Design a protein around this ligand. Sequence first.
Ligand SMILES: [Mg+2]
Ligand SMILES: [Mg+2]
Ligand SMILES: [Mg+2]
Ligand SMILES: [Mg+2]
Ligand SMILES: [Mg+2]
Ligand SMILES: [Mg+2]
Ligand SMILES: [Mg+2]
Ligand SMILES: [Mg+2]
Ligand SMILES: [Mg+2]
Lengths: 260, 188, 226
Amino acid sequence: ARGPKKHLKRLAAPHHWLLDKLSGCYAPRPSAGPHKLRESLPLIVFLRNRLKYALNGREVKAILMQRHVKVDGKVRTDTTYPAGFMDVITLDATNENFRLVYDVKGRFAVHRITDEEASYKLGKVKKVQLGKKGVPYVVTHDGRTIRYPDPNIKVNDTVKIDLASGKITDFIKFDAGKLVYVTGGRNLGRIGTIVHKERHDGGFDLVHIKDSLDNTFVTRLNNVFVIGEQGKPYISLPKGKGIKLSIAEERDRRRAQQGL
Amino acid sequence: GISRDSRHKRSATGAKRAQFRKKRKFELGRQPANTKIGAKRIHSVRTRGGNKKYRALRIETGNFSWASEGISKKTRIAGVVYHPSNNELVRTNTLTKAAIVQIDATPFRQWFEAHYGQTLGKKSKNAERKWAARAASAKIESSVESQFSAGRLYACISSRPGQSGRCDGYILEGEELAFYLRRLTAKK
Amino acid sequence: MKLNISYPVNGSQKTFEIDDEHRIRVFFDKRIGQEVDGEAVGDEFKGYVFKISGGNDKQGFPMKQGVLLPTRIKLLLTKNVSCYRPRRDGERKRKSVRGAIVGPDLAVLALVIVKKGEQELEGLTDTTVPKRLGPKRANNIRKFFGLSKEDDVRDFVIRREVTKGEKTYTKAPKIQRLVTPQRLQRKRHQRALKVRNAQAQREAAAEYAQLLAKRLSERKAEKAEI
RNA sequence: AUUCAUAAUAACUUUUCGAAUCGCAUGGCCUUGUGCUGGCGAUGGUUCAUUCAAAUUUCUGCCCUAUCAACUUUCGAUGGUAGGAUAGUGGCCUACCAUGGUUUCAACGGGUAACGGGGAAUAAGGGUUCGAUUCCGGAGAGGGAGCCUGAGAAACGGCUACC
RNA sequence: GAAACUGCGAAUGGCUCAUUAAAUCAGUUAUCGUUUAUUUGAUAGUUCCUUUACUACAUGGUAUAACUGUGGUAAUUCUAGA
Ligand SMILES: [Mg+2]
Ligand SMILES: [Mg+2]
Ligand SMILES: [Mg+2]
Ligand SMILES: [Mg+2]
Ligand SMILES: [Mg+2]
Ligand SMILES: [Mg+2]
Ligand SMILES: [Mg+2]
Ligand SMILES: [Mg+2]
Ligand SMILES: [Mg+2]
């Protein structure tokens, strides 16, 4: 009312942040940025709640103001900076890099990557438009604009960004039999192969995805993120590879691990 | 002040609505510009998100296109002769969109001379070759030939003076010109 | 009443009591901006010419320029006007201000000397008040000293000495708008950046045009046969 | 799916923007000088995209009451055309025109000790009752109205008037 | 580093449930019907007086706050003249 909100009450924050109900009336409201706040991970949440490198927001700010953290090659001292899917977080100390990918349970999982993979990233083509002076450009899922793209790059394709200059180094078309990653809905974290897609002119193209071990599901086209071909993904998968074992066989694996 | 909300209206069933909330700034209206003629006077109004608008009050000149020749000329406005919404706008010479006006015919005459050279109404080969090539397009329309003879040209305003602050338009031609000639400008 | 009189060429000020109210009537039915002769005002102001700069009535309400009344009225005052300092952005307040026309109800009349008289006064023209501080901007100092245009202003900046009891030390204002190598470096950096971005865009456009020419030739010469 | 994105032509404009801003470092090349050339930033700055939003908006769904059966429409009610206004669609308003629109499948009017919802108590099943109150949405700041500044307020620990 | 100018915020939060019965609200739609500070990405070699006025870009000038003083008012986060 009367203008934009600046507070985010706890119990209204996204559930996949996994915030404790107590210990605070509020939650870190993501600032405006590359990702929507519903599907973004604030830096303070990643650093304090996920990595335990800080005890509280004061220590998170102490970390950030030393230029230690950088997202996608830029320092980003903002405490509530909205780091989202496919983003690369780099810590100058500890010599490690992280890529923000959901695990199969639909939450960002702490996933460590190498320097070569941290050098680049992927992006989903949201729109291909002619800009001013007739210059074509594409818009990626992380709010990034790249002028002069390949003419064959269409909507909801995947492009590879060099992350040191905002340039496309490769692209994957959206076609049957390509490895896709689900980024929304009840199928967050699943990794599978496109079977086919339903047209449905008038909205909400539907995509059928087959898992690695033959679990078939359907999803909206807005939640589909191409990441490679049948086998050989362009991005290192997190621990689990997005299979969604049933709770019974997760129990069985947990018991096998715990009881040796 | 002036409000554009639909709350104050009766329901489509005819029922009176209970007051829901106080008037909101994001539904306001403002008073009409009522653009007159002569002694140019623009006022700027600040609108939502910044984005200032220009109130044209008593302006006297405007840019008018001659769609048959692909040229637009800056020309002053003589007066309003017809308005399809209200005759009072004609009587008070109010300049709004779709208003029928007479302008000057003079810049268009001079351009016609320089482009064709047909001494319309009542040197070197460099220009003569151009005139000869542009010939066979010198004839335009009798109904605008006579307006040039009269010295003023019928035009329709296509800009919104109360919004942009400008009174631009186009010369009436063809079926549109014959229609507006029948309506009020002729037959007294 | 009281006459707060200022002699501005040296910045001197003093207040004069004038009882025997049958003599301040020279001011009556006058307004701010009108000159008055000092001989009627008193026998000390022989030839002195005062002009009304302002005043305050009883109850202390200031006089507003343009209010052509001998009484005070309420007015909705806005930013950058006299008799009102806004406390917020866009705040406007209704305040009572005294009219511009001089009357018997005035407690203090603010006057300024525009012409010197024949005698001298105990605290107005016999003394002077130095200016608080000198010019700060480079061309302001250059105008103040009036030497030339190709002259150093560092040596002509005015300096003030302050004693702490054991050590005296001078201080001078930081000159603004002074041309410096740092400013020149910033300007040429911006200039070079604009040029470099222009070549970068032209090169990218040329490369894209090459790519389109290659694809246009290949994808269509290959399908011509089929 | 477009009179879309773009791009071109003819002009138009109280002529918008196109860096007279700031901090660290202060290298390279000599034409040897208030010479050339130089990095990392900060603050700005049209426009497009993005994000946080906002405003309008489709369909369906609300408690009791006929001791409320007809209601709306000169003071807009239902549509058309044109204009004005608005950030923008729209009777939002104006001019002219047509006589429309809702209703026993309950309109219209009256009442509510009515803010709506997530939800709560009880509960074989079906249900009954509650939800001012921790989250979401709305509204208001003694009652009304008006407005400035601002990207954003009809703001009230802002202003103006009346009570 | 007081004060003050400039910028930004003060339209968030917190409180209450008076109004409100197709209204709010919920789920579901649309913006090919619009505004959007801020964030993020991209993004201005065209400024020729609105030419036979390129006249400083080694960088244009005005006018003020704070301060120095004279003050008014019983009184307010009132303010005048210099
Ligand atoms: Mg209309
Ligand atoms: Mg209509
Ligand atoms: Mg109530
Ligand atoms: Mg409730
Ligand atoms: Mg309110
Ligand atoms: Mg603001
Ligand atoms: Mg209070
Ligand atoms: Mg408040
Ligand atoms: Mg609130």
